[PDB]
Every structure is written in C-alpha cells, then in structure tokens.
Amino acid sequence: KKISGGSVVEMQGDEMTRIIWELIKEKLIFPYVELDLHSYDLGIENRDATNDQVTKDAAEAIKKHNVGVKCATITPDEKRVEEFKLKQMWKSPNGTIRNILGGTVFREAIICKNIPRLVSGWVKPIIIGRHAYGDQYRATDFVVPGPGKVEITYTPSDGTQKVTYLVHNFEEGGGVAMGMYNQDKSIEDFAHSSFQMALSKGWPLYLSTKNTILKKYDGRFKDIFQEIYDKQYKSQFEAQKIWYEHRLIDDMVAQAMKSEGGFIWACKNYDGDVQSDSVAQGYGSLGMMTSVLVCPDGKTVEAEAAHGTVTRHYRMYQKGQETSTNPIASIFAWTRGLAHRAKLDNNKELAFFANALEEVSIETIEAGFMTKDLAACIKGLPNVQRSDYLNTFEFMDKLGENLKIKLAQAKLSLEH
Amino acid sequence: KKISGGSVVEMQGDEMTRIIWELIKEKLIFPYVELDLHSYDLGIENRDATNDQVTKDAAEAIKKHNVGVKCATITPDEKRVEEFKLKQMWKSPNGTIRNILGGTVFREAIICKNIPRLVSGWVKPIIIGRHAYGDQYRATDFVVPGPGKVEITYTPSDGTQKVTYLVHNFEEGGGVAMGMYNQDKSIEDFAHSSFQMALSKGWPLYLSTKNTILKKYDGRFKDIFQEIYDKQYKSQFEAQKIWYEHRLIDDMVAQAMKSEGGFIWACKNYDGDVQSDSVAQGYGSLGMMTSVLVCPDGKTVEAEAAHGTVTRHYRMYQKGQETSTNPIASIFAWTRGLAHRAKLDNNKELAFFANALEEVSIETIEAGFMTKDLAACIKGLPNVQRSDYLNTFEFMDKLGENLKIKLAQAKLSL
Ligand SMILES: O=c1[nH]c2c(Br)c(Br)c(Br)c(Br)c2[nH]1
Ligand SMILES: [Mg+2]
Ligand SMILES: [Mg+2]
C-alpha cells in the first residue's frame, strides 16, 4: 500500500540534473506514492526533435492538471547548437512555460542549521516574489546594422489614432535596439500574490522598481501596487503590524543586505532573476533554494529546480569519474508540487509525506551528511577532503534510509 | 602662496550634500588651491528656473575643460514636483550629463582598516565599470491605454527597406511598453576602458550580460568585448597572468559574493547602477564609494558624489537639530577631479595635494574620528552613543586640522 498521489505533470531535463531526477523518483517518491504521472521530455534533444512543441504541450498540461514539477534544462547558446547539432537556438523553456501560465515565482532559501550564511545578519527568511511575465523575457531585440531611425508605435484596436515615439536616430554606425512590454492584468495578479504572501507569512512587503528613470513603465507597477494595497489590503496589514513600501531597486538591495531578513521582496522579472540567486548565495548556497510559480487562478502551480544543469559534474560523470551533486533543489521541486497536489485534493497522507521528505532532506544535512558543495560551505573548498562529503549515490542512499525511518515511525505512532 | 589648480567645472547640488559641498571648498580646497572654477548650479530650483538648460551647459563645459566635479542632486518624482512647485518632473541630471559625455563610470569602495565588511571574504578591491550610455537611461517608455498593437520599426537612412517587429498585441486591457537602444561605438569604448582598467590594476576582467535571453541585444556586448580582447588585449592579459571572461549576470553576482575580490566587473548601465551600490554596501558603507565617469576621448572625466541627498538629515538640519553626515563621497569627487586635472597639466603639487586629502580622509576615520553612519558600521546602530561619533562640523574640523598637518610636514620635508 502506497499513498494515492493523483495527477502530476512532470518535465524531464538535461545533463546531471536529469540523472538525479530519475534517482529521486526511483528511491524517494515511487516506493511511497502512486502517481498518475503526465511526463514530458524537455531534454534539449527532444525539444529539438519536436521543434520546441513539447515545451508548449507541457505548459498546457499544467493548465489542465494544476501541478507541474520541472527538472532544470539547457537554454542553448552558439556552443550548445554545435554540440547537439540543433536546428535553431531554442528559447528558454522556463520563459515559454512562464509566458503561457503567468504568475509569480516565489523563491526562498532551504535553511540548514549547520550551513554558514555569507550575510551574518540574515536571521529571518527573505522571500523573493519574482513577476514571471513579460519585460526582458518576452522582448523583441535586434541588431541595428547601420545609420537609420528606430521608432516604436502604438495603434489602439479601434483604429482612431496612432502614436509614434522615436527610440533613436542612429547617425554614425549601428548598434542594438529592443522593445518590451507588460500587461496591467499580469501586474495586478503579481500585486495580489505578493500582498497575500506577505499576509500568510506575517512579514512586511517591499516592491523594488526604477520609477525615477522609467517613469511610465515602472511607475505603472508602483501605481498598481499602491492602488491595490489602499483598496484591499491596508487594514489586513495594519492588523498584523506589517506594512507595504515601494523602494528603488539600488536602495532596496543595500537595505536588504544590511537587514536581518523577515520580509517579502516583490521583484520585476529581471530583478527577481538576479536577486533570487544573490539572496540564495547570501544564505550560504546558490543551489539551496525553492522555486514555485504561483499562477493567477490560485489553483495552478509549477515547482522547479531553478539552478544549472551542472555541466562540469556531467563531464566528470561521462568520463567515469566520481561526482557529488546536490539533489535538494530537485527534491524540493517534487515536495512543493506534491504539497500543492495534496492541498487541492484534501489529501492528508500526501501532505504528510511531502513535508516529511523536506524534514528528512534538512535533518540529513544537519546530521553532517552532505554533498561536496555543502561541505565546502562549512570548511572552505581547499580544506575539503573526500571524507567530508558523500557522492551523489551515497547521499541519495542516506536520504532514502532516513525517509523510510521517518515514515515507518509515523505509521507506528498513529497505530494508537 | 596656494597651488595653481587650473580649470575645473563644478556642479552644485541639493539638500544636505549642498551644505557639505560648501564646507569642503571653504575648509579643504580654497585655503590650499587657487582654481579657475566654472560653476553651474544644478540645484532643483535652478534646474526648474532654466528649464534644465543649466545641466546641458554644465555637460558642454566639461567637454571644453576636461574636468568636472559634481555634487549629488535630486531626480524629482510626484512628491518633489508638489514640494518645489516644479514646471515638469525633470529627468535625472546624471542621465543627461552621461548621455552627452558618454563613457564608463568606474566605481570602487573607499576602504578604512577599522570599518567591518558585510562580506568577510572580500580582501581585495572590486572595481565596477558601469557603461554610462543608453539602455534604460535613454529609453522611450509609455502607458498602453487599452487593446491595440505595439510595434518597433527600423528604417535605414538610405530608405531602401523597413523592418517592423511586433512587440505585443494587447487583446484585453492595456499595460506598458518601452523601446531602448545602444550604439556600437559606445559599446566599443566601454570595452576599451574595461580592458585598460583591468591592465592598469593587474586584475582579471568579467563582463556580465543576459545574452541567453536577449540574444541579439546582449549578444552584441559579448561579441564586441570578445572581438576587441582577441585583436588588441589578449597577449597583454597573458603577460600579466590575468584573463577576460563573459558571465551571465545572475551567475556573476553569486560568483562575486563568494569570491575574495580583486577584479574588474564590466556592467551594463542598469546592472552597474545596482551592483555598484551592492558592492559598496558589501565593503561596509553605501556612502564610502568613488564614482568617476571616464569619457571616450581619454582626456575628459566627471567625478561625482553618487550616494543620496540625505533628505532625513536635511529635515533635521532645517529644524535646528544636530546632524552627522558623511562628507567622504563629496571629498573624493574633488580629489579624483583634481588628480585628473593634475595629470593633464603635469602638475606635481596638485597631484600631491589630491592624494594627501584622500590619505587624510582615510587616516582620520582610522584614528577613530567619524560620522554616525560609520560609527554604526563598527558598533551596530542601537549601540551607538553621541560620544562614538562627530557631528558634520566637528568631523570637517578634524579633516581640516589633519590636512594642514600633512601639508605642513610635507613642505618641511623638502
Ligand atoms: O544584485 C545584487 N544583490 C546582492 C545581494 Br542580495 C548581495 Br548579499 C550582494 Br554582496 C551583492 Br554584490 C548583490 N548584488
Ligand atoms: Mg537566476
Ligand atoms: Mg545607484
């Protein structure tokens, strides 16, 4: 007897993280949970073979089944095109999925008592709410080949007017130009999700923009957040002795760095990409971070392993060398996805399991059993010896052992 | 007898930094240096009164005299428009000046042995090379009022073709849109300045972009840097056992944070704005940072006090309250400007003076005499008592006393 998991959309990935993904399912999920798994191969070869259609199909399946769990993938560059003999330099699958679903990607460090922080003052968590739609991630950028005029136009759908703004007149040589946008409804959804997250955690909320420079573009984010706060959330914030404030991005980063944590940080798409990584590194390890896309319907989520594909480790693995790759981000993509699945299905057994696997992952590391990266955090990379860490397989074995113990003990406890 | 300073363009600023600016010239510069000072009032009231023309005139005067020194100014928002009863919400004077001059803004922490870092590993300096032209700082952004099509077009000056790219078709409601650009020549100048800085310091250089997303726009920065490195700087870097590498911005920040410093970080305009402040905060204090615009001609510079205008302190000052405002950024705008002036004029006396004032500023803080902000860095703001710091006037007095001693001793040593 396994737990009835329900419907989950899974997206397979690339390189080392693809290997780890299969170990996780084989050792940590499948022995305990029975799932109706809707699998999509987002490996670079399958994306190339389906002309990136598999990415769009996976995003539509998430809309249908409400929970997706995604493995980290390769976003190809010139070198990758040559390596895999790709038809095109395919766009980021994350950008494609996020553009289809919309929402806010909430990112937070996975804290272990024995991992030292780079920022000693951060005693409370920092949650990054990254706007997942538009801006640089759905932009139109091109090379300007020589002298000439770049203009940007708006034509309302009634056809009664046309506005033409001059971007730049290139007089000597060329350069680059780009157009980008955002949608009012997407900004409103981002605001609602940020206010709701601040209220569920009982922490103040800060929105960062550069509205002093982008008066109209960033000014709209600032105006939409303020308007929604004043009309729908101000009394709720006052009741919990918390607040909402707008800050300039350069002021916000410096304020975050010298703070003690304990706040929600609403970031525009590009800033949330950079800041979520910086904050994760500030808590100790870039890889020790959750990443959950919360869609506007309040029912759909996509949990992911946000970090790289770890090419260096993958090359070693191919050459038959020993590797010690951290699987926690991939584990927490599963647990966060299963926890949301459990919440939708009112499934106490799956809710218990998802939480238990997160506890086991943290308790394992805190018991002194970890991969090379985490061992380097504690000791410093030059002082790390083979005895200080477990290889990928040894670490997964330790986790499997600890998970079995935790679930067996919980079964025996509820037997009265 | 005073030192013959030469021609310097000065730009007066706003609020608390304006007060401090006058104290600096009165106590630290004028008693020792005779200057042909070309003064421009970039105070928010004068910018409003001249319809922001004073900003453009100051930028042209920098082109002419090759040295500018700028006080921090207000970039107005809605609240500022009401406060000063402004005709318009005037654009950032820094954006206006940088757009006219072009170049790279080099930013670096001002290190004092007794100020604790937030990042314990940073034992060597991090120099940020911020591209000072285009991108978000010369963008065309607007509100999209409802459903309709946003398009971006390119028309070559020969008129033989027209490219129209669809930005977005707004189907339900409106939003926002923007167009932005950069110039090949400006990118090439940014590359040259970054490679030259890395070679003068003997440190590796990293360029950060998001070329995996903005394949064409950021790809051009990456291609121009690589092309210039391979053709003009690779052997020079190999001779100093240093290197140049491109990194994705999110990877670069994490790598910088866990490093020990000791590198040049070439940043695009927007990233250099955020990262220069983050790095300054990592070394201990946001305000303890130099900011020098190095123009493409290799002759023109604009040194500035890049931090805030300290409105909170200014309000206290107006109410007759005691204030303790750090003047170091404004002092180093003067010293960096005078050092460049001295280099152009081959003036050993001015070169000595500029360096001496930087030494005095650091030695004064290291002797335990500092403003409230620096005292809070050492003790923690709740543990700071009035006896731990000097007010603005007391601190400026300490510096003046120390500067007089240093210059008198150097004169006697001749
Ligand atoms: O953009 C960012 N963010 C950031 C942080 Br959150 C830290 Br702790 C640090 Br030390 C630095 Br350099 C940065 N840069
Ligand atoms: Mg990232
Ligand atoms: Mg800044």
GROMACS .gro file of C-alpha atoms in nm, chain B:
model
  414
  417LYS     CA    1   5.104   8.101  -0.169
  418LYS     CA    2   4.847   7.839  -0.293
  419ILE     CA    3   4.875   7.562  -0.557
  420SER     CA    4   4.785   7.661  -0.918
  421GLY     CA    5   4.482   7.434  -0.974
  422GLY     CA    6   4.370   7.519  -1.326
  423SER     CA    7   4.026   7.490  -1.486
  424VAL     CA    8   3.759   7.283  -1.311
  425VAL     CA    9   3.385   7.261  -1.387
  426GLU     CA   10   3.180   7.238  -1.064
  427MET     CA   11   2.816   7.135  -1.038
  428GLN     CA   12   2.636   7.240  -0.717
  429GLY     CA   13   2.366   7.008  -0.585
  430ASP     CA   14   2.079   6.963  -0.341
  431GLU     CA   15   1.970   6.936   0.025
  432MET     CA   16   2.236   6.815   0.283
  433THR     CA   17   2.505   6.738   0.019
  434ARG     CA   18   2.479   7.103  -0.098
  435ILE     CA   19   2.566   7.231   0.259
  436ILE     CA   20   2.863   6.987   0.289
  437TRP     CA   21   2.986   7.086  -0.061
  438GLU     CA   22   3.044   7.449   0.051
  439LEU     CA   23   3.216   7.339   0.376
  440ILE     CA   24   3.458   7.123   0.164
  441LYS     CA   25   3.559   7.405  -0.069
  442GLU     CA   26   3.589   7.655   0.224
  443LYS     CA   27   3.793   7.431   0.463
  444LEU     CA   28   3.970   7.172   0.242
  445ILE     CA   29   4.025   7.314  -0.108
  446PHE     CA   30   4.030   7.701  -0.124
  447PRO     CA   31   4.295   7.754   0.158
  448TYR     CA   32   4.542   7.540  -0.044
  449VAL     CA   33   4.436   7.552  -0.409
  450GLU     CA   34   4.372   7.851  -0.641
  451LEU     CA   35   4.117   7.737  -0.904
  452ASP     CA   36   3.964   7.875  -1.224
  453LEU     CA   37   3.623   7.740  -1.119
  454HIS     CA   38   3.340   7.718  -1.381
  455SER     CA   39   3.036   7.692  -1.153
  456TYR     CA   40   2.690   7.559  -1.255
  457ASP     CA   41   2.402   7.544  -1.011
  458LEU     CA   42   2.228   7.204  -1.061
  459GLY     CA   43   2.011   7.263  -0.753
  460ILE     CA   44   1.648   7.156  -0.828
  461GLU     CA   45   1.525   7.524  -0.814
  462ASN     CA   46   1.786   7.646  -1.069
  463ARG     CA   47   1.723   7.347  -1.299
  464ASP     CA   48   1.348   7.434  -1.281
  465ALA     CA   49   1.424   7.808  -1.347
  466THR     CA   50   1.642   7.734  -1.655
  467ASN     CA   51   1.411   7.453  -1.785
  468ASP     CA   52   1.702   7.207  -1.717
  469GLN     CA   53   1.931   7.400  -1.959
  470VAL     CA   54   2.196   7.453  -1.683
  471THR     CA   55   2.250   7.067  -1.686
  472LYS     CA   56   2.324   7.068  -2.064
  473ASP     CA   57   2.552   7.377  -2.031
  474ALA     CA   58   2.749   7.210  -1.746
  475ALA     CA   59   2.796   6.895  -1.964
  476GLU     CA   60   2.927   7.109  -2.257
  477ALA     CA   61   3.165   7.296  -2.017
  478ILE     CA   62   3.306   6.950  -1.909
  479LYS     CA   63   3.370   6.870  -2.280
  480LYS     CA   64   3.561   7.203  -2.305
  481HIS     CA   65   3.764   7.199  -1.973
  482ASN     CA   66   3.802   6.813  -1.942
  483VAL     CA   67   3.736   6.803  -1.564
  484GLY     CA   68   3.404   6.814  -1.386
  485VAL     CA   69   3.320   6.768  -1.014
  486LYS     CA   70   2.954   6.705  -0.932
  487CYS     CA   71   2.754   6.734  -0.606
  488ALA     CA   72   2.463   6.487  -0.557
  489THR     CA   73   2.128   6.617  -0.697
  490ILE     CA   74   1.752   6.541  -0.667
  491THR     CA   75   1.588   6.339  -0.955
  492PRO     CA   76   1.226   6.455  -0.894
  493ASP     CA   77   0.917   6.233  -0.855
  494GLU     CA   78   0.547   6.340  -0.796
  495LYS     CA   79   0.608   6.442  -0.430
  496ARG     CA   80   0.911   6.659  -0.533
  497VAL     CA   81   0.705   6.836  -0.807
  498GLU     CA   82   0.447   6.941  -0.536
  499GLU     CA   83   0.726   7.030  -0.284
  500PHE     CA   84   0.919   7.266  -0.515
  501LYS     CA   85   0.614   7.362  -0.735
  502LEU     CA   86   0.815   7.239  -1.040
  503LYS     CA   87   0.711   7.312  -1.402
  504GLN     CA   88   0.791   6.950  -1.505
  505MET     CA   89   0.922   6.628  -1.349
  506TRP     CA   90   1.279   6.695  -1.477
  507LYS     CA   91   1.490   6.397  -1.589
  508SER     CA   92   1.795   6.278  -1.388
  509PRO     CA   93   2.082   6.533  -1.437
  510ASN     CA   94   2.329   6.237  -1.418
  511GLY     CA   95   2.149   6.067  -1.710
  512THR     CA   96   2.158   6.398  -1.907
  513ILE     CA   97   2.535   6.456  -1.840
  514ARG     CA   98   2.632   6.088  -1.908
  515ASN     CA   99   2.425   6.086  -2.229
  516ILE     CA  100   2.614   6.398  -2.355
  517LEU     CA  101   2.966   6.284  -2.249
  518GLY     CA  102   2.948   5.906  -2.287
  519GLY     CA  103   3.194   5.665  -2.128
  520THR     CA  104   3.224   5.430  -1.831
  521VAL     CA  105   3.158   5.519  -1.469
  522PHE     CA  106   3.419   5.345  -1.255
  523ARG     CA  107   3.305   5.279  -0.901
  524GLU     CA  108   3.512   5.148  -0.608
  525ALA     CA  109   3.480   5.131  -0.229
  526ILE     CA  110   3.681   5.376  -0.008
  527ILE     CA  111   3.847   5.130   0.236
  528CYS     CA  112   3.923   5.205   0.602
  529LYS     CA  113   4.106   4.935   0.809
  530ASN     CA  114   3.859   4.975   1.103
  531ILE     CA  115   3.530   4.954   0.904
  532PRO     CA  116   3.395   4.595   0.904
  533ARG     CA  117   3.280   4.446   0.573
  534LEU     CA  118   2.942   4.270   0.539
  535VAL     CA  119   3.124   4.024   0.304
  536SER     CA  120   3.416   3.885   0.509
  537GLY     CA  121   3.584   3.722   0.205
  538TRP     CA  122   3.640   4.050   0.009
  539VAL     CA  123   4.015   4.102   0.094
  540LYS     CA  124   4.094   4.266  -0.243
  541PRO     CA  125   3.902   4.551  -0.417
  542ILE     CA  126   3.616   4.509  -0.668
  543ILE     CA  127   3.605   4.778  -0.934
  544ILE     CA  128   3.275   4.825  -1.116
  545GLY     CA  129   3.297   4.956  -1.472
  546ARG     CA  130   2.940   5.079  -1.539
  547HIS     CA  131   2.859   5.153  -1.910
  548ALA     CA  132   2.732   5.510  -1.882
  549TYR     CA  133   2.530   5.531  -2.205
  550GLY     CA  134   2.186   5.424  -2.329
  551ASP     CA  135   1.970   5.122  -2.231
  552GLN     CA  136   1.708   5.214  -1.960
  553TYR     CA  137   1.873   5.559  -1.907
  554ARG     CA  138   1.774   5.685  -2.258
  555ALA     CA  139   1.460   5.477  -2.311
  556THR     CA  140   1.120   5.560  -2.455
  557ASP     CA  141   0.856   5.414  -2.219
  558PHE     CA  142   0.482   5.478  -2.220
  559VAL     CA  143   0.146   5.356  -2.090
  560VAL     CA  144  -0.057   5.136  -2.330
  561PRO     CA  145  -0.415   5.263  -2.251
  562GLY     CA  146  -0.604   4.964  -2.388
  563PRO     CA  147  -0.625   4.692  -2.655
  564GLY     CA  148  -0.408   4.754  -2.960
  565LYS     CA  149  -0.078   4.675  -3.128
  566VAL     CA  150   0.273   4.780  -3.020
  567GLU     CA  151   0.536   4.758  -3.294
  568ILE     CA  152   0.900   4.860  -3.322
  569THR     CA  153   1.045   4.961  -3.658
  570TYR     CA  154   1.388   5.017  -3.808
  571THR     CA  155   1.430   5.235  -4.123
  572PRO     CA  156   1.790   5.255  -4.264
  573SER     CA  157   1.889   5.610  -4.364
  574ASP     CA  158   1.929   5.503  -4.738
  575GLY     CA  159   1.547   5.433  -4.739
  576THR     CA  160   1.585   5.103  -4.932
  577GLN     CA  161   1.399   4.893  -4.664
  578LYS     CA  162   1.188   4.894  -4.344
  579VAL     CA  163   1.175   4.626  -4.072
  580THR     CA  164   0.867   4.611  -3.847
  581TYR     CA  165   0.877   4.380  -3.543
  582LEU     CA  166   0.562   4.314  -3.340
  583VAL     CA  167   0.632   4.391  -2.968
  584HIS     CA  168   0.284   4.285  -2.848
  585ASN     CA  169  -0.079   4.276  -2.944
  586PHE     CA  170  -0.275   4.380  -2.632
  587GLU     CA  171  -0.603   4.185  -2.654
  588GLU     CA  172  -0.753   4.250  -2.307
  589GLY     CA  173  -0.679   4.581  -2.135
  590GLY     CA  174  -0.361   4.785  -2.151
  591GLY     CA  175  -0.025   4.795  -1.981
  592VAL     CA  176   0.318   4.937  -2.060
  593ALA     CA  177   0.573   4.925  -2.336
  594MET     CA  178   0.921   5.062  -2.397
  595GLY     CA  179   1.190   5.090  -2.657
  596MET     CA  180   1.559   5.118  -2.578
  597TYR     CA  181   1.887   5.101  -2.763
  598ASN     CA  182   2.262   5.111  -2.753
  599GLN     CA  183   2.534   5.218  -3.001
  600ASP     CA  184   2.825   5.003  -3.135
  601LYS     CA  185   3.080   5.287  -3.085
  602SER     CA  186   2.964   5.338  -2.722
  603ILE     CA  187   2.997   4.960  -2.656
  604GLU     CA  188   3.348   4.954  -2.817
  605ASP     CA  189   3.455   5.249  -2.592
  606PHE     CA  190   3.316   5.066  -2.285
  607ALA     CA  191   3.514   4.752  -2.384
  608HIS     CA  192   3.841   4.956  -2.433
  609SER     CA  193   3.803   5.138  -2.096
  610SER     CA  194   3.731   4.800  -1.917
  611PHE     CA  195   4.032   4.621  -2.072
  612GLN     CA  196   4.260   4.923  -1.993
  613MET     CA  197   4.138   4.934  -1.629
  614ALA     CA  198   4.197   4.560  -1.581
  615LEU     CA  199   4.554   4.603  -1.723
  616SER     CA  200   4.638   4.910  -1.508
  617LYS     CA  201   4.529   4.727  -1.187
  618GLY     CA  202   4.664   4.387  -1.288
  619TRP     CA  203   4.330   4.210  -1.226
  620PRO     CA  204   4.107   3.984  -1.437
  621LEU     CA  205   3.803   4.135  -1.609
  622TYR     CA  206   3.448   3.997  -1.619
  623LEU     CA  207   3.162   4.127  -1.834
  624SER     CA  208   2.809   4.038  -1.715
  625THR     CA  209   2.507   4.018  -1.958
  626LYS     CA  210   2.186   3.814  -2.001
  627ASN     CA  211   2.271   3.707  -2.364
  628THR     CA  212   2.089   3.372  -2.322
  629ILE     CA  213   1.763   3.578  -2.309
  630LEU     CA  214   1.848   3.899  -2.504
  631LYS     CA  215   2.040   3.704  -2.774
  632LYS     CA  216   2.079   3.999  -3.011
  633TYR     CA  217   2.099   4.296  -2.770
  634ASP     CA  218   2.329   4.146  -2.502
  635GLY     CA  219   2.493   3.921  -2.761
  636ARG     CA  220   2.633   4.237  -2.922
  637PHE     CA  221   2.802   4.346  -2.593
  638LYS     CA  222   2.953   3.992  -2.559
  639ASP     CA  223   3.069   3.986  -2.929
  640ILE     CA  224   3.222   4.337  -2.917
  641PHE     CA  225   3.415   4.258  -2.593
  642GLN     CA  226   3.542   3.920  -2.727
  643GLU     CA  227   3.645   4.067  -3.067
  644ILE     CA  228   3.834   4.361  -2.903
  645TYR     CA  229   4.004   4.125  -2.650
  646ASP     CA  230   4.125   3.876  -2.920
  647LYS     CA  231   4.255   4.151  -3.153
  648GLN     CA  232   4.401   4.406  -2.905
  649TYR     CA  233   4.440   4.283  -2.544
  650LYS     CA  234   4.478   3.903  -2.511
  651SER     CA  235   4.867   3.900  -2.516
  652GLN     CA  236   4.876   4.194  -2.269
  653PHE     CA  237   4.643   3.999  -2.030
  654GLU     CA  238   4.852   3.676  -2.078
  655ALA     CA  239   5.170   3.882  -1.992
  656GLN     CA  240   5.015   3.986  -1.654
  657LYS     CA  241   4.868   3.634  -1.589
  658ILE     CA  242   4.515   3.786  -1.593
  659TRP     CA  243   4.211   3.699  -1.809
  660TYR     CA  244   3.885   3.828  -1.953
  661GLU     CA  245   3.562   3.623  -1.924
  662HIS     CA  246   3.195   3.682  -2.000
  663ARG     CA  247   2.944   3.566  -1.733
  664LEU     CA  248   2.565   3.564  -1.703
  665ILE     CA  249   2.461   3.840  -1.461
  666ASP     CA  250   2.286   3.602  -1.209
  667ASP     CA  251   2.594   3.370  -1.211
  668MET     CA  252   2.830   3.675  -1.185
  669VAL     CA  253   2.665   3.817  -0.872
  670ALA     CA  254   2.680   3.480  -0.689
  671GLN     CA  255   3.042   3.430  -0.805
  672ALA     CA  256   3.134   3.789  -0.687
  673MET     CA  257   2.971   3.726  -0.343
  674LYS     CA  258   3.170   3.408  -0.275
  675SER     CA  259   3.499   3.547  -0.423
  676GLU     CA  260   3.780   3.731  -0.244
  677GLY     CA  261   3.752   4.040  -0.471
  678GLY     CA  262   4.040   4.153  -0.692
  679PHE     CA  263   3.872   4.200  -1.030
  680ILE     CA  264   3.717   4.450  -1.268
  681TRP     CA  265   3.347   4.395  -1.326
  682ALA     CA  266   3.220   4.549  -1.655
  683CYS     CA  267   2.843   4.615  -1.604
  684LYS     CA  268   2.576   4.735  -1.849
  685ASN     CA  269   2.421   5.071  -1.742
  686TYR     CA  270   2.132   4.927  -1.531
  687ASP     CA  271   2.334   4.645  -1.364
  688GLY     CA  272   2.621   4.883  -1.285
  689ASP     CA  273   2.376   5.110  -1.108
  690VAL     CA  274   2.251   4.827  -0.878
  691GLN     CA  275   2.582   4.635  -0.842
  692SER     CA  276   2.798   4.939  -0.758
  693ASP     CA  277   2.565   5.010  -0.461
  694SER     CA  278   2.553   4.639  -0.355
  695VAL     CA  279   2.935   4.611  -0.370
  696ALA     CA  280   2.979   4.942  -0.175
  697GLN     CA  281   2.738   4.803   0.093
  698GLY     CA  282   2.930   4.469   0.097
  699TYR     CA  283   3.256   4.658   0.182
  700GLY     CA  284   3.075   4.821   0.476
  701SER     CA  285   2.913   5.152   0.381
  702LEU     CA  286   2.697   5.253   0.081
  703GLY     CA  287   2.837   5.611   0.101
  704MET     CA  288   3.209   5.504   0.107
  705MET     CA  289   3.247   5.482  -0.273
  706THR     CA  290   3.418   5.676  -0.557
  707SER     CA  291   3.234   5.743  -0.890
  708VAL     CA  292   3.431   5.867  -1.190
  709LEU     CA  293   3.298   5.895  -1.547
  710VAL     CA  294   3.587   5.826  -1.788
  711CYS     CA  295   3.492   5.967  -2.133
  712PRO     CA  296   3.589   5.803  -2.469
  713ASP     CA  297   3.845   6.078  -2.563
  714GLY     CA  298   4.077   5.952  -2.281
  715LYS     CA  299   4.113   6.314  -2.163
  716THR     CA  300   3.774   6.407  -2.009
  717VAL     CA  301   3.641   6.296  -1.664
  718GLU     CA  302   3.343   6.382  -1.441
  719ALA     CA  303   3.385   6.286  -1.071
  720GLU     CA  304   3.070   6.275  -0.858
  721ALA     CA  305   2.927   6.211  -0.510
  722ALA     CA  306   2.697   5.917  -0.621
  723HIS     CA  307   2.502   5.850  -0.297
  724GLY     CA  308   2.174   6.012  -0.180
  725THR     CA  309   2.094   6.373  -0.099
  726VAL     CA  310   2.027   6.267   0.270
  727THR     CA  311   1.671   6.420   0.297
  728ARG     CA  312   1.622   6.280   0.656
  729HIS     CA  313   1.938   6.462   0.779
  730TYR     CA  314   1.833   6.776   0.584
  731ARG     CA  315   1.489   6.787   0.757
  732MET     CA  316   1.669   6.764   1.100
  733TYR     CA  317   1.911   7.045   0.992
  734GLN     CA  318   1.613   7.270   0.893
  735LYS     CA  319   1.452   7.208   1.241
  736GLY     CA  320   1.782   7.324   1.401
  737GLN     CA  321   1.872   6.964   1.507
  738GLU     CA  322   2.226   6.822   1.521
  739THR     CA  323   2.339   6.617   1.217
  740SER     CA  324   2.631   6.380   1.146
  741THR     CA  325   2.653   6.346   0.767
  742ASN     CA  326   2.940   6.161   0.599
  743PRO     CA  327   3.119   6.401   0.354
  744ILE     CA  328   3.375   6.144   0.217
  745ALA     CA  329   3.199   6.081  -0.124
  746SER     CA  330   3.189   6.455  -0.192
  747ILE     CA  331   3.557   6.489  -0.079
  748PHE     CA  332   3.668   6.209  -0.316
  749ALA     CA  333   3.471   6.370  -0.606
  750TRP     CA  334   3.701   6.674  -0.555
  751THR     CA  335   4.026   6.469  -0.511
  752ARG     CA  336   3.953   6.246  -0.812
  753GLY     CA  337   3.874   6.554  -1.024
  754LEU     CA  338   4.190   6.740  -0.905
  755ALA     CA  339   4.405   6.426  -0.957
  756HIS     CA  340   4.287   6.408  -1.319
  757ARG     CA  341   4.338   6.788  -1.362
  758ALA     CA  342   4.696   6.743  -1.222
  759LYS     CA  343   4.765   6.451  -1.463
  760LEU     CA  344   4.651   6.660  -1.770
  761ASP     CA  345   4.855   6.969  -1.661
  762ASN     CA  346   5.159   6.761  -1.540
  763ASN     CA  347   5.112   6.941  -1.202
  764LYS     CA  348   5.306   6.752  -0.926
  765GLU     CA  349   5.190   6.988  -0.650
  766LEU     CA  350   4.818   6.938  -0.730
  767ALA     CA  351   4.877   6.561  -0.774
  768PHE     CA  352   5.040   6.553  -0.426
  769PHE     CA  353   4.759   6.761  -0.272
  770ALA     CA  354   4.475   6.542  -0.417
  771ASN     CA  355   4.635   6.219  -0.289
  772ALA     CA  356   4.717   6.385   0.051
  773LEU     CA  357   4.348   6.479   0.104
  774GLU     CA  358   4.242   6.114   0.032
  775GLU     CA  359   4.508   5.989   0.285
  776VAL     CA  360   4.389   6.242   0.548
  777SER     CA  361   4.020   6.134   0.500
  778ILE     CA  362   4.106   5.763   0.546
  779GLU     CA  363   4.360   5.824   0.835
  780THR     CA  364   4.102   6.045   1.017
  781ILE     CA  365   3.840   5.766   1.008
  782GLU     CA  366   4.105   5.501   1.103
  783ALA     CA  367   4.213   5.723   1.402
  784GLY     CA  368   3.851   5.668   1.528
  785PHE     CA  369   3.704   6.004   1.425
  786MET     CA  370   3.392   5.954   1.211
  787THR     CA  371   3.025   6.038   1.139
  788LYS     CA  372   2.725   5.842   1.295
  789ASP     CA  373   2.682   5.610   0.990
  790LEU     CA  374   3.046   5.488   1.014
  791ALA     CA  375   3.019   5.453   1.394
  792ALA     CA  376   2.701   5.234   1.336
  793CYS     CA  377   2.904   5.010   1.099
  794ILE     CA  378   3.153   4.934   1.381
  795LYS     CA  379   2.914   4.916   1.685
  796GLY     CA  380   2.565   4.848   1.543
  797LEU     CA  381   2.313   5.139   1.526
  798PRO     CA  382   2.137   5.053   1.865
  799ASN     CA  383   2.478   5.053   2.050
  800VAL     CA  384   2.582   5.396   1.910
  801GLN     CA  385   2.617   5.681   2.165
  802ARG     CA  386   2.679   6.054   2.093
  803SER     CA  387   3.044   6.007   2.215
  804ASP     CA  388   3.110   5.744   1.938
  805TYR     CA  389   3.088   5.997   1.652
  806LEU     CA  390   3.144   6.358   1.539
  807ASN     CA  391   2.876   6.589   1.402
  808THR     CA  392   2.920   6.717   1.047
  809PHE     CA  393   3.107   7.037   1.155
  810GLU     CA  394   3.334   6.854   1.407
  811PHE     CA  395   3.430   6.594   1.150
  812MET     CA  396   3.513   6.860   0.885
  813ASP     CA  397   3.728   7.038   1.153
  814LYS     CA  398   3.922   6.714   1.225
  815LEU     CA  399   3.989   6.673   0.850
  816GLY     CA  400   4.098   7.038   0.810
  817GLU     CA  401   4.335   7.004   1.111
  818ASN     CA  402   4.478   6.675   0.974
  819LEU     CA  403   4.515   6.814   0.620
  820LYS     CA  404   4.706   7.125   0.748
  821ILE     CA  405   4.945   6.893   0.948
  822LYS     CA  406   5.006   6.658   0.650
  823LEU     CA  407   5.077   6.950   0.408
  824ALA     CA  408   5.297   7.142   0.662
  825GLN     CA  409   5.503   6.826   0.730
  826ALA     CA  410   5.544   6.753   0.358
  827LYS     CA  411   5.659   7.118   0.297
  828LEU     CA  412   5.921   7.091   0.585
  829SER     CA  413   6.043   6.753   0.443
  830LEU     CA  414   6.155   6.931   0.114
   0.00000   0.00000   0.00000
